[PDB]
Each structure stands twice: as C-alpha cells, then as structure tokens.
Amino acid sequence: NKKFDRSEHVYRNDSFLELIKDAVRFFSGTPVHSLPPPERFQGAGVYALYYTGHYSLYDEYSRINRLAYNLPIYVGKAVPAGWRQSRISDHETRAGSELSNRIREHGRNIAKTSNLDLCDFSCRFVIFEATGSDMISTVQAALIKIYKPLWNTVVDGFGNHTPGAGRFAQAKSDWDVIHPGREWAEKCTGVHSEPYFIEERIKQYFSK
Amino acid sequence: NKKFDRSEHVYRNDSFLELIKDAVRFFSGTPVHSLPPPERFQGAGVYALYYTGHYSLYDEYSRINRLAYNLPIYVGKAVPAGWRQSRISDHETRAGSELSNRIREHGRNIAKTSNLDLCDFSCRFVIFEATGSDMISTVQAALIKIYKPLWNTVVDGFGNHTPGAGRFAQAKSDWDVIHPGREWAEKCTGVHSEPYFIEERIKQYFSK
C-alpha cells in the first residue's frame, strides 16, 4: 500500500555546487609561487600551472596572464597511493608529500625541454587534509571544466611517466612531439601526431 | 625571495563538514520503505537497513527503533561499475539501477536465512545524480561513522558475494555463521568464528 516517489529520495545538488565554486574561489586567491615553489611541504591536493612567457605557440598566455594569473595551462591532483585502490577507499593516518613532489616533478620535466623556460611558469596549489581530502578529485575536475587547460584538453601527455618495458609500441604523446625531450619518450616509435596538426589544435584552442 | 606559508594553502573543511551533516539530515527525513521497496527505480546512491523485530540477538533494535527509524543495522552504497576503476574516475551519460538492485539483493539474502524475517526490515535510500554522485562515498562514510551500524563494524560479511573458484580456503564470515545460509557460504571450510563470540561481540555493541 505505501506510495513510492523517486524524487522524494533525490539529493539536490545546489549547496554542493555552491561549495565547489567557493572552493575554486579559495583556490584562486592562494599565493602564486614559482615552479617549483621555494619550499617542500606535506599534503595531498590540487595544483595549477600557469605560463607567462613567449614560446610562439603559447605566447597568447603572456597576454591572458599579463595582469593576473587567470588561465592555467595545466591542472592536476596528487594523492597518496593509499587512496588509489589496491585495494582500499582510504587507508592510513596522514598522507605525506605527494603534492610538493608531483609539482617538483613537473618542474624537472619542463627543465628537460629545450624550448620551455622554467622561469616562465608559476603554480598555485591547495592542500586538502582530513575529511576535505574527499574534495580533491571534485575540485580538480571543476578547474578542468571551468578553464579547459590546454595540456588537459587539447595537447595530451604532460602528466605521463615511462610506459613499462615492451609497451614502447604506442606513439609518443602530442606533448612530447612539440616538447622534446624526456629520454623515455624517444623510445615510442609508433607514428606520433605531426607537429603541424598539434599546432593547428593549439591555434584553435586560442581562437574560441 | 618570496615567502612560503603552508597554512595559506590549506583548504578549511568547516563548510564541507556542514554540508555532509546537512546531507545526513536530508537522508534521515526521506520516506522509510519496506525491504525491498514497492518499486524499482533508477539511480546510484546510499542506503540504510533498519531492523525492528525480535530475533533474540537483535531484539534491542525493536526498542531503539520502536518510535522512529533511528539506528541502522547496515549502511552501504551502490554505484555503477563505471565509477569503480577499470580504468576510469567516472565514464558515461547516466548510471542505471545499482541502488534499487543492490537493495533488492539484500532482501533476497535475508529471505534465504531461517532466523530472519524480511517483514522486520525497512530501508531508507538517497539517490545522488550528476555532480552530487561525488558525495556518495562521503555520505556512506559519514553514516557509518555516526551510527557504527552493527553489520558494518562488528559482525562483518553481509555485503559479500561468492569468493571465486578455489578461493574457498578462507572461513565463512561472522554474518554467515549466525545467519545460515546462502548456498555459497556452506563451502568455505576455513575455521569460522564461533557463534558464542559473535554473540558476545553483539552484546558488547549494545552495552556501549
């Protein structure tokens, strides 16, 4: 006899959406640092990378980001391996220095390229700590959706590591073709994209 | 030269904690239904099971839950297999009928036991839909922390499925010893806990 009405069981997303936007605004007001920042620190969380230099493909950023760090070229997260399943949802006291280490690592990948200068990059980051560490993937995904950062949405590959012995069959990523060279990328020998079409995709990113 | 201060990068968890508690209060006010509810429905989300009968181990619930459905015996979540990694963070349009199906399934596991009557069980559930589906694991974990439901924290096993061919080496779960019998549990033939010590753990649950 009891009446069933699905909509009476549906959680309304409005406050959660307001909270995510507040988290983005908190993110935006945090200190911009050099890439990598001047000190190591503990914590997991979310980071953005900004470009303000004049490498020709990217030199529009020197205008977009002339007056404020507005537009990231890249957004990522760093969490301890304990929160990635193998197998668990979240297992341990505290999670060490993933964010700092992941940022420093981007800094060395960039220092390895010839056509990019580390001095043209800055970074913002937010540490999410206890229960708030549940927000990390949501804030990373909201920034990617708001900003559509070039190295997340158009030119893939920046965040990848060595593929793993005998999986050097696939091609190198669009990021490695226009930014040689990490040693490991020289190995791929699939047919990678052509610089030209990567460049046309970049130019497209910037006209809309 | 630029000053580094970690605490300037730390997200404050207070609003997020308020939001989780609001989500729990929303959960608590939703309609209580029979187990399983009178209709199937679409959605992923979070559910709780309540007991109000007189099976002797559990008959304290008939008092705790005499006037209101206050204390769950079990809390779980149901999400599509697409959000569990294999491999992706979240991949597809909408996620079908995991919650309804997971609840119905608990209902049949219970109907298979001799000493439990389906008529002494009720359930509440909340569907989290688009961006709110990010809250599912957080709300499930908050309910487990607030209520410490017996079949989550003391008597393990209710939510398990058949182990998988030649992994019938481990013992049956505490739930299967005091609630025979799902066919598959008869197979384990490790040394399972003794009913007595399970019962003493239950009795302990209820004196504190």
UniProtKB/TrEMBL annotation, chains A, B:
Family annotation (Pfam families): RE_Eco29kI
Organism superkingdom: Bacteria
InterPro entries: Restrct_endonuc_II_Eco29kI
Molecular function per GO: identical protein binding
Name of the featured protein: Eco29kIR
